[PDB]
Design a protein around this ligand. Structure first.
Ligand SMILES: *[C@@H]1O[C@H](CO)[C@@H](O)[C@H](O)[C@H]1NC(C)=O
Ligand SMILES: *[C@@H]1O[C@H](CO)[C@@H](O)[C@H](O)[C@H]1NC(C)=O
Ligand SMILES: *[C@@H]1O[C@H](CO)[C@@H](O)[C@H](O)[C@H]1NC(C)=O
Ligand SMILES: *[C@@H]1O[C@H](CO)[C@@H](O)[C@H](O)[C@H]1NC(C)=O
Ligand SMILES: *[C@H]1O[C@@H](CO)[C@@H](O)[C@H](O)[C@H]1NC(C)=O
Ligand SMILES: [Zn+2]
Ligand SMILES: [Zn+2]
Lengths: 312, 310
């Protein structure tokens, strides 16, 4: 009457560690996970998201990622057989997961010669002619934020989609998994719904802490949600939710995709604020009554390397 | 349990007509004013704000407003004597008003020959070589929205500032009052606080329905808040709060100003969601960042034009 997204008394979510939500867009994120490890949201100096600069980055005038060192994305359609793809509302995002061996991947450039001192972010500092190898980054889930977490030169987008990947191969430091994220931005559009978003949006649960299996035959065209013009900005950053772990390689696609007025409303209602009447999560009746948001405030670069990659 | 901005139990605001708030960014704005007239928020086809198009508008490829027909803005500093400039929290925005004779104005082109059929929005359809007069647009107040009400080619800005003007002269139709708004956008910036906003932000009240006098000597540099590069998009639109009355001439300045990370937070907490434990019978504090914007509205075939400054 009303409850922030992530705090609804009808939530069936389970929480390991301290409670958190997006009420102050992460300004109050100090706490511990289920294991007692302190979050680094407020203490790290390589936090995400960032306000991507115009100067020497988006203006095209800085050191760019050499064509041969660019990340490459290969996403086929994600397909449900009726139980093999799920849409989840975890009280922090709308997230897609899958329980079959989906073959989407990206490959990321690494130094050809590497050892324990190398990290997934090393491409940021490679010279264009450095001997390079490639590692496979496997998507683990994708999820959403409104409004966008990244800004481009001070501008906000209605929606951002994050595809989270794990790398376990080749780099000695990655045996236990290193991470990389690709972010896609959506600008508001005056046309019909972006049909590529509908397999998610038409199926997303509104109740916190629940999931829905996508109906058999549901197709998510992840390779089409990804921009065809694959310009991106890349930098070392963090998870944008507690515990905000650092060392992630970020790609932010700079060519925004489209989202309709109504789709933006539907998404924000799914992460909305709820009014609840009592009569144990089942002892409440809740309805979304206000459009919500689930984004983290932008973080300072603090001198980090941030580079543009021009596609072809 | 928190309260939407505009619904706080400690609010001292008064309301004539139906209550409303920005909870659904205006989707649910069906209602009647104090005189029983229906709001037109959900029924009009000249509603504001709009998502300003790239195609034949921001690309500069469309029909542009001729230099001679461009709106011109003349804003000197606003200056408080301790009681003469106020910052108001009305439960719907943070608004600046003044109770002295401030000399800020704008001028808007109108056809030289005019009759009762003519309207303040006539400039939109004037030909570059048409005989023009000018009318004075007098600012009545200015106020803020986060995030921005206008989008530019599908992009949102953290803050928008609206300077509301009344025109009463020359146009027969403007007895008594036609209206025009100028909107200034602020893009997020990684630098220090924009000092131009501080006279307002340092003094804005957090309690809904209240105001605060700006300290004697406090200056608001309105003419510097306005971009110096005066490119704008212009169209016929509406109020962006109930009753959403139409017939307004809009100007949206296309060159954004800067707002710091910390200022954007401060503003959003001033329009924040409140937790509370007779308006004076309650103690409330802002606990979550808020917003006070209306959703974008379709153009519905309206004329939208770019004006290039000089
Ligand atoms: C759907 O896929 C899951 C995971 O691959 C599998 O366990 C299940 O047997 C499948 N059923 C159908 C209908 O193909
Ligand atoms: C890691 O590589 C560097 C660079 O060639 C080298 O100097 C160093 O000895 C290597 N250390 C290990 C762990 O082998
Ligand atoms: C401040 O200005 C107001 C309105 O112009 C005036 O009524 C008031 O007397 C002034 N107070 C001063 C100069 O102390
Ligand atoms: C002015 O009004 C007259 C009489 O109503 C009408 O003939 C004419 O169309 C109007 N002039 C213009 C061009 O607005
Ligand atoms: C109780 O809360 C809601 C249930 O989530 C609504 O059904 C209802 O509007 C409310 N009580 C009333 C009548 O205001
Ligand atoms: Zn994310
Ligand atoms: Zn306004």
């Amino acid at each position: 009457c009303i409850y922030k997204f992530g705090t609804s008394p009808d939530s069936k979510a389970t929480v390991s560690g301290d409670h958190w939500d997006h009420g102050l867009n992460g300004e109050n994120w100090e706490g511990k996970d289920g294991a007692g490890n302190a979050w680094v949201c407020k203490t790290g100096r390589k936090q995400s998201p960032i306000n991507v600069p115009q100067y020497q980055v988006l203006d095209g005038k800085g050191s760019k990622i050499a064509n041969g060192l660019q990340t490459q994305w290969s996403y086929p359609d994600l397909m449900s057989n009726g139980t093999s793809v799920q849409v989840i509302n975890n009280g922090h995002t709308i997230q897609v997961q899958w329980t079959y061996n989906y073959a989407g991947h990206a490959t990321i450039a690494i130094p050809a010669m590497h050892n324990q001192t190398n990290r997934i972010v090393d491409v940021l500092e490679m010279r264009p002619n450095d001997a390079a190898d490639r590692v496979t980054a496997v998507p683990t889930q994708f999820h959403f934020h409104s409004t966008s977490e990244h800004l481009l030169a001070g501008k906000i987008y209605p929606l951002e989609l994050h595809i989270v990947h794990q790398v376990t191969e080749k780099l000695e430091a990655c045996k236990g998994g290193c991470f990389s994220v690709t972010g896609i931005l959506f600008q508001l559009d005056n046309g019909p719904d972006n049909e590529l978003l509908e397999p998610i949006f038409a199926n997303m649960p509104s109740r916190e802490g629940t999931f829905s299996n996508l109906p058999a035959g549901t197709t998510i065209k992840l390779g089409e949600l990804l921009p065809s013009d694959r310009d991106y900005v890349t930098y070392e950053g963090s998870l944008t939710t507690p515990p905000c772990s650092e060392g992630l390689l970020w790609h932010v696609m700079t060519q925004p995709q489209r989202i309709s007025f109504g789709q933006w409303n539907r998404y924000r209602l799914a992460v909305g604020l709820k009014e609840c009447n009592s009569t144990n999560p089942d002892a409440y009746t809740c309805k979304a009554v206000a459009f919500g948001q689930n984004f983290r405030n932008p973080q300072y670069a603090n001198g980090r390397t941030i580079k543009l990659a021009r596609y072809h």
